[PDB]
Amino acid sequence: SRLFVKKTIVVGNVSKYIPPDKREENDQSTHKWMVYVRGSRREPSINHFVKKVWFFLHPSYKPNDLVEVREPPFHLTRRGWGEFPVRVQVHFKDSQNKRIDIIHNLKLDRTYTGLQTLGAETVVDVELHR
């Protein structure tokens, strides 16, 4: 009675610098970034319990500032110039598990090599009714 399991959810992002000769005209974006929602390496895939993920972006991305991803991978790739707090809202398959908001501070590459680098990861434990 009142049984639960804990599962790890990791929100992270990677990015790469885009040199000027590879930038779209009148896009001020200096980077290509990707935010991901994954599980720990030591646990089963989160697709077993995650229904869908909403990514809330900074208003500069309007009218495309709310992006729904229903199937894995729960990845979102965009170009940009600025770091901002990404709100990731995780929805679970089992209705008994309420949605959670995770705020991930987007971290952009500063090596400027044009290679992809790891930016940041935000780790939370969630509770799943059993």
Binding site: N105, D109, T111, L118, A120, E121, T122, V123
Partner: peptide, 8 residues
């Protein structure tokens, strides 16, 4: 949440 970030 437990945050970790690369300096560069």
């Amino acid at each position: 949440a437990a945050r970790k970030s690369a300096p560069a």
